[PDB]
Write a protein that binds this ligand. Structure first.
Ligand SMILES: [Mg+2]
Ligand SMILES: [Zn+2]
Ligand SMILES: [Zn+2]
Ligand SMILES: [Zn+2]
Lengths: 350, 78, 576, 40, 115, 159, 48, 139, 238, 179
RNA sequence: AGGGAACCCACUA
DNA sequence: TAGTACCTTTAAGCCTCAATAAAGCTT
DNA sequence: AAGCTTTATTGAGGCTTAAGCAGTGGGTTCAAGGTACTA
């Protein structure tokens, strides 16, 4: 129906006023409700309340084209309740925290002047020096890059008893899984260190009061997943499963010492019924992970009025739990002006 | 010797009226002279006002003992 | 698993033993009916022709039940089953062989629900024991349950789509105990707060304030038409208050006929001046604002929510305590019927003309808002130029916000009172406010004078941008417009920023409604389960299920909460 | 003073909370230390 | 589903009786005329024509419920006169008034149609 | 109609079902042995859809009693387990007993004649659960059987 | 419409191209690389 | 309270546990009544005193502070069937089975479970037929 | 209406029962005055006024939110230009008696919506019908002739009433009445062959001390689900 | 720009030529936090005391802050805001003609009004919601009166004669399927 | 004269 | 050789560790 | 002597259990593909 006139649409028994924007899945018109999320690659500094961390600067980092699982890195300060206040990091795939200067030594810079050049951009304010000194103090025992990498690797998911295995595992974690939006290739440790020092610097500024803290519900801190990103998130997993079943089929047909039919190797029903299932049920994942996945992403298009159809096609969703009793995500934020209707919202649990 | 209240409680009134109405509906002998009456509830109410319901209320004290009050012995509020 | 079968609100215990689906229940939309008594519910014919009461066959009702069996399940005033003594059910929907339609004494006939049948009628959430009362069935044509209007206050019901549930008691014993314990007239006064739960509401309240004013004069035909709707009327037309030049009755005479027995009550109207009772006209009231009902006759006074409402010591309360539930039920019905039929003569509207003040009042309102905004600018200039010194206990921010909020609240209150003084005695907003029927004075102020300050989590509108509430203001603007003080009324309409700030303020009530309904219900359930077995025993002690003494006498005095009243100790306060 | 009320305070009352949100006292002062603010 | 047919506004079903008199004993010389399948159209004219009668001490009508089609007229008279006689006289005067109105309307139509 | 006397419940006594009682009241005399429910068109004896355990079809009858699907309350089968295993709802109680009795002689760690034991059976005579709590608090600090009885060191039960 | 057009015009090809080529051995190697995608118009296949 | 020039009579708290450990169980009953009254009547509403008194007497009946939770209600001498009807159903019934608890069927929820007449209002007495009064009734 | 003013139809009067203006215009819909003051839908009244102006003028009125070209005084002056009261009131006459109503009634064209919530889609009654297969209680919902849940709060209110027998028939007799046979010794549910009058209890090996017990079916189900957990809920009828 | 947009069909001048003119531009929420907005071009003329002389953007029309279901509310700035929320909820439940090809569709539930009317009082945003073409409601002569007591507590008295003439009559469609 | 369950979503007061 | 039947979200309690300190046993 | 050693309090961490009532309606999927083996 793309580019058809009103007469051509009426020839096909279609309504010219129908806006489209939905999918016909098994004769059911299915609309993809836009899902909001925190913006990736942006450093947000919050105050975790009643916790061991006074401040926390997170950066949900995503590669922006490859779109692996978004690897959040936290750079936190400990609460006062020790001879100072201390900055630590929470790396992905490292189940324990790491103090930040050990991470900077693992990235290649061994000296303290180099690390503080990556963190503190003007040396002429000593108030910010006073806060980084404890972090330099508990990284005193670590003065070399491989020693720091061993410190990283001895806290990983499965620390292999070989020391060089720990070194290689730590190098892989700090290259591919720490701040991948900065870069995942080699020779990217200076840019990763500059961005990590930027995260530490933002945390220091927020702890100094020199910069205000970030708002969870500021709507420039949010992004909306429309039909494109949602369907691409599905299609990445289903194409991964397609390549997995092709490698399984071809492996089974080369252990036998034969040749495989590649046109018969492709399991074309992996993409087909996977997309069809997720759009028909609304659970956004696989069939075997229905509880794990989130529901209500795909809804039946409401066709009671033209206005209800148009409203359903322009609906957003904050996926925060509907049994949540905190008022703040349900507040009408100031930053919704002109972007989100201040009047249109449901009554009740949502 | 009977320490409970001489008045009939509202729960006692409701249950005596219900029990007596069911008895009349099961063709118990009416104690009063019904005058064109048919509904067993009105007959039970007319028996209750006339203090003629042949029912004993057994009130249980919390210690385990009981007191037997006849309906004709209790003061009829409503 | 079995544990998952037994646990939760949906498990076996809470979802199938404490509460369960029941037979002989009905549910449909509720619509008003001013013509029903307070203990009647109007039932659709399809609901009644589907719900059956098992009537035991006696020689008293052999013929009536024989006719009901002969009519069958097709005709509505008919029957659905015959249950013999042995217990088999002869289904009357198959029109069976005529040997089956024989009725002996001891048979049960499951006749259709008819007029006068007792039902429990219920609205969820069932919060208190007046949310589930007994009603007499009246069969009415269309498809809704129909309620009286005084009854919607205990049910917390209105007719914007509410549905209520109708349970039919199936035994004579349970029908009798609903009749003797849970009917609507017996549920008039609550033990929770020793006042009525149900009072004169809405139209009848507005029109009984209009009806009992001093200058309401009814002619002969109007009086006879109103006396047609008085059920307790003795057939004697009262002597008119004015006989010459023409015979005219006042509204107080007709209401004195409505008032039952010889009730003795003294109230004051909502607009009673504070300095009148000390004045020379203590008993000769210039504004008719002191209500005196003496020997069941409205001597003087305009009736309102203070007299005919759900307050303690009101006219319906005194009527209950002195006359009983049946007389007070008739009182409720008579007020509603007579007043609703007089409202056909008088009428009651609300228009766009009632929301409009004179130009002098508009000028006064604009002057007050302008001077208050200038005061806020002066406070801002004092805080900028370091002159603002904190009050003890607070820093400069709570004192600046307190000063600005005090200026703006004094603005809203002063200009709302300026708006309310402009309202004539013909105003309909004022008619519903000073009668207590609907709306308050802040509603009049917001509609006419100024909406006021919008608040999010108690403070003013927060700086959701970088130090701006919206990108239409400059940074660090603490003035009234910037932080959510709506300067216009609803009549004048809001500016776009005021519209957004008002939507931010109004979202708070919606969120609060949702979360309070989530949490308060859990609190109520925990309250119930902690005390469900506590009861007054026959030695008058209050014990729990363990027979542990909770109170040696109920309430420490041994009395029930319904019959007690607010009284005054004479000897406590005066000097020796 | 910013003491809690409403339904949170009722919940803190019926659930016997060892940590109420806004615990407080109302200290009353004896004699001449309550007449003037300097000794208060 | 529960809609009454539109003809029960005005049609007596078999066995329904158009008007019944009930001499209420509450006050002397009063009757309750219960008229079935009628509305305010006749109740109001009968009530007002009864109010023109000086021997009628009370005259009022009511519709007990608007979802039912039933008029209750209550007439009380002086003791030298009866409510049944008052009701008959009121209907005769209404019929004579409407006959006069119809004839004068025909005369006026015939005058204006010609000119 | 039933000929049994109709009378109500004055008491619901709780307890654990003895395996002797399960074997004695079962209708599946050999025990449930086959996981399949139907042997073709027949329900398998000793299977899960045991015909002695109730009424399979809506129009059939039970085999233990002769009642139809309405009158039949259903009757209990049993599986004789190859190896005894833990009841998951009774784990915590088994651990509370295990730290109270000896691992080897199964004697109570504290004396039955102990004055502390004497006055806690005094103050918790009608309360079995609080009596277990007090005996558990007495036996929690111990590490060795006193004795008459052995004197072997006792382990720490960790779940 | 614009989000779906981006997915079906840019994102599917980018997902296909940004995938590891599969290698099969153990013996000769077998390398499969995926190149440009083609989306046809919506077609239905009958029972024949 | 121990301070000089502080009234040791009128000085109070809104911490219920603090009043209970400092002053006792009757003092915390009165303080609980005062606090619940303050919460209820700050809105302007009024609840009759006997309902507050019954709640406070129920909370302070057994000498300690009985919370309105599963930690105060399900730790009473009430039966297992009453406790399992509130919260922690399977745990309560496990504990009752293990210790052989006997439910005396004297509560309301217990008899509601088993379909019996609850000893509550209408069901708190028995009705007996009087044979001597039956001699005056005609068939 | 388009201002949050929802409400069911309470009654329908014919045209000769409706109030009417001097030109014979009966309202299609009469709404309560009391719906306005607590809700403060002043846009509803402005829409009635603007709709009167639009219907007399022949325009379609403009009600775009933030407009200084439209206020209530301009709409009023336009309305008074058409021989109407400027505030939109009219003298209505009683439809029944013909008498002028003493108050003048705000009447004008307002856009009403019919909502999908109809009463014939919502009316439901049950007497006796389908029951759930597991717990033998009435079914769920009006689409399958199910019953209404007499829930826990209704149970609590009927406790507060003191209506013990109504509570008993709601929670036992009108949902799932059932009979079991119990051994008087062990308290476990016995085996009862009703036709041959053979009552027995396996385990105690008695055949005479068996008692009929009326309990809800869901309670029997609870006890059989407790016995699956190796609990013996021994109903002691002694 | 306006005279050239008045002729979008005669001229082939559109919104994208207005974006390409550097006249309008899209501002997201983070950029909106650094802009200075005039609500109207009224805010740009010089005042006797000036609020801001450094406006960088202007609102096109301030009623574009509302969505689809709140753009049908007439005079929404004269309403209390929860009532606007309730109408946004209840405009989706309003019965009209939901689509023009409803005779072809076998929807499970369908509700078509007999005589939908466009509103007599309109917002200018309902020209773009196509509410003039697929309207959901009828312009009703509505009296605000207390008549006989049957409209109390949020009820409506309706004209039976109007309903007989087709007022708010509608047809309900239920579709059943079997394989 | 009555052969479904579970989950999800939307909605009503 | 083609074909059909079967194989496999947070908030408050309680409980349980490591860590201490008078106080009796043993210099 | 002053050291040594043992049974009762603390503080943090881990486990468990709870989170309103009553209604409608629709939609999907359960129960599914490799196989090992024959007449
Ligand atoms: Mg409502
Ligand atoms: Zn059986
Ligand atoms: Zn041992
Ligand atoms: Zn036995």
């Amino acid at each position: 129906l793309n580019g058809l006139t009103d007469r051509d649409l009426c020839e096909l028994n279609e309504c010219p006023l129908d806006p489209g924007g939905y999918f016909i899945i098994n004769g059911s018109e299915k609309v993809l409700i836009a899902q909001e999320k925190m913006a990736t690659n942006t450093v947000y500094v919050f105050a975790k309340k009643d916790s061991k961390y006074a401040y926390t600067g997170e950066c949900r980092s995503c590669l922006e084209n490859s779109s692996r699982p978004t690897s959040t890195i936290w750079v936190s300060m400990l609460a006062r309740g020790a001879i100072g206040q201390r900055i630590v990091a929470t790396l992905p795939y490292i189940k324990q925290e790491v103090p930040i200067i050990i991470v900077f030594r693992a990235l290649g810079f061994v000296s303290d002047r180099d690390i503080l050049e990556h963190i503190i951009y003007d040396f002429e304010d000593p108030e910010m020096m006073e806060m980084v000194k404890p972090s330099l103090d508990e990284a005193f025992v670590i003065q070399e890059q491989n020693v720091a990498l061993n410190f990283i690797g001895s806290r990983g998911a499965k620390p292999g008893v070989t020391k060089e295995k720990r070194i290689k595992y730590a190098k892989e974690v700090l290259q591919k899984e720490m701040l991948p939006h900065v870069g995942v290739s080699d020779f990217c440790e200076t840019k990763k260190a500059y961005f990590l020092g930027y995260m530490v610097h933002r945390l220091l500024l927020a702890a100094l009061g020199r910069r205000e803290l970030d708002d969870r519900d500021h709507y420039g801190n949010k992004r909306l997943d429309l039909a494109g990103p949602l369907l691409a998130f599905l299609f990445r997993g289903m194409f991964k499963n397609l390549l997995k079943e092709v490698r399984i089929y071809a492996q089974k047909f080369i252990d036998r010492g034969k040749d495989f039919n590649l046109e018969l190797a492709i399991k074309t029903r992996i993409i087909s019924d996977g997309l069809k299932y997720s759009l028909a049920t609304g659970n956004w994942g696989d069939q075997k992970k229905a509880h794990q996945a989130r529901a209500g992403v795909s809804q039946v298009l409401n066709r009671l009025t033209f206005a209800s159809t148009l409203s359903h096609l322009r609906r957003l969703n904050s996926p925060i739990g509907r049994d949540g009793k905190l008022a703040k995500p349900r507040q009408l934020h100031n930053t919704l002006w002109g972007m989100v209707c201040p009047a249109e919202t449901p009554e009740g649990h949502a | 010797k009977r320490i409970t209240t001489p008045y009939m409680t509202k729960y006692e009134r409701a249950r005596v009226l219900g029990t007596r109405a069911l008895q009349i509906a099961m063709c118990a002998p009416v104690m009063v002279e019904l005058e064109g009456e048919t509904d067993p509830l009105l007959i039970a109410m007319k028996e209750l006002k006339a203090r003629k319901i042949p029912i004993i209320i057994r009130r249980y004290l919390p210690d385990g003992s009981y007191e037997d009050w006849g309906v004709d012995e209790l003061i009829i509020s409503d | 698993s079995l544990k998952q079968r037994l646990k939760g609100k949906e498990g076996r215990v809470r979802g199938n033993l404490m509460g369960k689906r029941v037979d002989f229940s009905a549910r449909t939309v509720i619509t008003p009916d001013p013509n029903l008594s307070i203990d009647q519910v109007g039932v659709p014919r399809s609901i009644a022709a589907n719900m059956t009461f098992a009537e035991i066959v006696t020689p008293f009702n052999i013929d009536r039940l024989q006719e009901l069996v002969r009519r069958g399940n097709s005709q509505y005033p008919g029957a659905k089953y015959i249950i013999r003594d042995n217990g088999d059910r002869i289904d009357l929907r198959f029109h069976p062989k005529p040997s089956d339609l024989h009725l002996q004494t001891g048979y049960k006939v499951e006749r259709h629900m008819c007029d006068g049948d007792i039902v429990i009628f219920n609205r969820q959430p069932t919060l208190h024991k007046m949310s589930m009362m007994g009603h007499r069935v009246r069969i009415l044509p269309w498809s809704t349950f129909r309620l009286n209007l005084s009854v919607t206050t205990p049910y917390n019901a209105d007719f914007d789509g509410d549905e209520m549930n109708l349970h039919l008691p199936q035994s004579l014993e349970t029908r009798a105990e609903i009749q003797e314990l849970a009917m609507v007239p017996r549920m008039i006064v609550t033990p929770q707060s020793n006042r009525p739960v149900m009072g004169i509401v809405q139209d009848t309240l507005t029109a009984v304030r209009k009806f009992t004013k001093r200058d309401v004069f009814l002619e002969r035909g109007e009086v006879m038409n109103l006396l047609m709707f008085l059920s307790t009327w003795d057939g004697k037309v009262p002597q008119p208050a004015i006989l010459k030049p023409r015979p005219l009755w006042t509204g107080k005479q007709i209401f004195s006929l409505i008032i039952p027995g010889h009730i003795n009550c003294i109230r004051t109207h909502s607009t009673h001046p504070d300095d009148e009772d000390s004045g020379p006209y203590k008993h000769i009231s210039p504004g008719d604002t002191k209500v005196v009902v003496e020997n069941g006759e409205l001597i003087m006074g305009i009736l309102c929510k203070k007299s005919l409402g759900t307050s303690a010591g009101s006219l319906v309360h005194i009527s209950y305590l002195e006359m009983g539930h049946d007389i007070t039920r008739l009182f409720y019905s008579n007020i509603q019927t007579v007043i609703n039929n007089w409202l056909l003569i008088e009428g009651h509207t609300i228009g766009i003309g009632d929301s409009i003040a004179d130009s002098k009042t508009y000028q006064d309102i604009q002057n007050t808002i302008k001077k208050a905004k200038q005061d806020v600018i002066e406070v801002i200039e004092k805080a900028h130029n370091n002159e603002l010194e904190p009050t003890p206990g607070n820093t400069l921010r709570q004192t600046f916000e307190n000063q600005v909020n005090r200026i703006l609240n004094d603005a809203r209150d002063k200009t709302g009172s300026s708006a309310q003084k402009s309202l004539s005695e013909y105003n309909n907003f004022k008619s519903m406010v000073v009668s207590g029927a609907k709306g308050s004075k802040i509603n009049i102020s917001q509609v006419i004078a100024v909406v006021g300050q919008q608040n999010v989590e108690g403070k003013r509108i927060p700086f959701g941008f970088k130090h701006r509430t919206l990108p239409h203001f400059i940074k660090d603007d603490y003035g009234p417009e910037s932080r959510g003080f709506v300067e216009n009324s609803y009549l004048a309409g809001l500016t776009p920023t005021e519209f957004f700030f008002h939507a931010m303020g109004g979202r708070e009530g919606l969120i609060d409604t949702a979360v309070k309904t989530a949490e308060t219900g859990y609190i109520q359930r925990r309250l119930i389960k902690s005390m469900e077995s506590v009861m007054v025993k026959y030695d008058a002690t209050v014990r729990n299920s363990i027979n542990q003494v909770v109170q040696l006498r109920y309430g420490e005095d041994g009395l029930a909460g319904e019959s007690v009243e607010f009284q005054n100790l004479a000897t406590l306060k005066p000097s020796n | 003073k910013n003491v809690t009320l409403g339904v949170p305070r009722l919940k803190e009352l019926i659930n016997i909370s060892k940590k109420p949100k806004t615990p407080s006292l109302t200290v009353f002062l004896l004699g001449q230390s309550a007449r003037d603010a300097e000794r208060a | 589903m529960n809609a009454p047919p539109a003809f029960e506004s005005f049609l007596l079903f078999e066995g329904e009786k158009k008007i019944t008199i009930n001499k209420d004993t509450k006050v002397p010389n009063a009757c309750l005329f219960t008229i079935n399948k009628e509305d305010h159209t006749l109740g109001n004219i009968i009530k007002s024509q009864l109010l023109k009668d000086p021997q009628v001490l009370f005259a009022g009508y009511k519709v007990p419920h608007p979802l039912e089609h039933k008029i209750i007229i209550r007439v009380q008279t002086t003791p030298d006169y009866s409510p049944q006689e008052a009701f008959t006289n009121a209907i005769t005067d209404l019929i004579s008034e409407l006959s006069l109105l119809e004839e004068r309307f025909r005369v006026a139509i015939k005058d204006k149609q010609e000119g | 109609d039933s000929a049994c006397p109709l009378r109500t419940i004055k008491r619901v006594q709780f307890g654990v079902l003895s395996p002797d009682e399960l074997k004695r009241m079962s209708v599946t005399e050999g025990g449930i042995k086959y996981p399949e429910t139907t042997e073709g068109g027949r329900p398998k004896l000793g299977g899960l859809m045991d015909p002695r355990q109730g009424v399979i079809e809506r129009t059939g009858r039970c085999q233990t009693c002769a009642g139809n699907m309405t009158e039949c309350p259903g009757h209990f089968g049993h599986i004789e387990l190859a190896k005894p295993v833990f009841h998951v709802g009774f784990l915590v109680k088994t651990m509370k007993v295990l730290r109270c009795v000896c691992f080897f002689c199964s004697k109570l760690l504290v004396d039955s004649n102990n004055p502390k034991i004497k006055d806690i059976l005094a103050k918790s005579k009608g309360q079995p659960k609080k009596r277990l709590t007090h005996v558990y608090d007495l036996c929690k600090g111990k590490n060795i059987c006193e004795g008459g009885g052995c004197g072997r060191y006792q382990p720490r039960i960790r779940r | 419409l614009d989000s779906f057009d981006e997915f079906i015009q840019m994102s599917v090809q980018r997902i296909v191209e940004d995938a590891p080529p599969i290698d099969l051995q153990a013996p000769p190697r077998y390398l499969l690389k995926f190149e440009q995608i083609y989306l046809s118009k919506p077609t239905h296949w009958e029972r024949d | 309270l121990s301070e000089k020039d502080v009234d040791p009579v009128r000085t109070t708290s809104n911490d219920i546990v603090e009043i209970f450990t400092v002053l006792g169980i009757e003092a915390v009953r009165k303080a609980l009544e005062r606090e619940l009254y303050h919460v209820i009547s700050f809105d302007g509403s009024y609840v009759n005193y006997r309902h507050l008194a019954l709640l406070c007497d129920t909370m302070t009946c057994r000498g300690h502070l009985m919370a309105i939770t599963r930690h105060g209600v399900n730790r009473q001498d009430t039966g297992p069937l009453m406790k399992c009807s509130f919260e922690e159903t399977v745990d309560v019934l496990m504990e009752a089975a293990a210790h052989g608890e006997s439910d005396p069927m004297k509560g309301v929820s217990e008899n509601i479970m088993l379909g019996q007449l609850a000893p509550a209002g209408t069901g708190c007495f028995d009705l007996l037929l009087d044979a001597e009064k039956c001699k005056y009734g005609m068939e | 209406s388009r201002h949050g003013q929802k409400g069911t139809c309470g009654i329908q009067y014919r045209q000769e029962d409706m109030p009417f203006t001097c030109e014979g215009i009966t309202p299609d819909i009469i709404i309560n005055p009391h719906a306005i003051p607590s809700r403060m839908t002043i846009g509803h009244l402005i829409e009635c006024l603007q709709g009167k102006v639009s219907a007399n003028k022949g325009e379609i009125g403009d009600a775009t939110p933030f407009n200084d070209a439209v206020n209530v005084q301009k709409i009023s002056n336009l309305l008074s230009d058409y021989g109407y009261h400027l505030r939109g009131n009219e003298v209505l006459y009683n439809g029944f008696t013909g008498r002028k109503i003493t108050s003048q009634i705000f009447i004008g064209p307002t856009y009403y919506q019919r909502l999908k919530h109809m009463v014939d889609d919502k009316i439901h009654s049950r007497a006796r019908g389908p029951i759930q297969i597991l717990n033998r209680q009435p079914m769920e919902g009006r689409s399958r002739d199910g019953g209404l849940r007499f829930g826990e709060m209704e149970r609590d209110c009927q406790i507060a009433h003191g209506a013990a027998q109504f509570l008993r028939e709601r929670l036992f007799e009108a949902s799932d009445p059932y009979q079991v046979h119990v051994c008087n010794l062990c308290g476990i549910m016995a085996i009862a062959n009703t036709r041959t009058h053979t009552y027995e209890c396996r385990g105690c090996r008695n055949k005479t001390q068996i008692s009929l017990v009326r309990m809800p079916y869901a309670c029997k189900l609870l006890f059989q689900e407790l016995m699956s957990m190796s609990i013996a809920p021994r109903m002691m009828s002694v | 720009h306006i005279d050239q947009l008045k002729e979008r069909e005669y001229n082939n001048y559109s919104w994208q030529d207005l974006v390409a003119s550097g006249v309008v531009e899209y501002i997201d929420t983070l950029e909106e936090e650094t802009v200075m907005l005039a609500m109207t071009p009224d805010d740009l003329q010089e005042k006797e005391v000036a609020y801001c002389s450094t406006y960088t953007h202007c609102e096109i029309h301030p009623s574009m802050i509302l969505g689809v279901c709140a753009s049908i509310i007439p005079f929404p700035d004269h309403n209390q805001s929860p009532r606007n929320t309730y109408q946004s909820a209840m405009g989706k439940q309003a019965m009209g003609v939901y689509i023009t090809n409803f005779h072809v569709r076998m929807d499970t539930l369908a509700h078509v009004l007999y005589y939908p009317q466009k509103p007599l009082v309109t917002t200018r945003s309902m020209e773009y919601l196509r509410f003039r073409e697929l309207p959901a409601g009828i312009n009703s002569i509505v009296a605000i009166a207390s008549y006989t007591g049957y409209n109390q507590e949020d009820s409506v008295i309706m004209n039976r004669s109007a309903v007989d003439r087709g007022f708010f009559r509608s047809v309900f469609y239920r579709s059943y399927k079997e394989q």
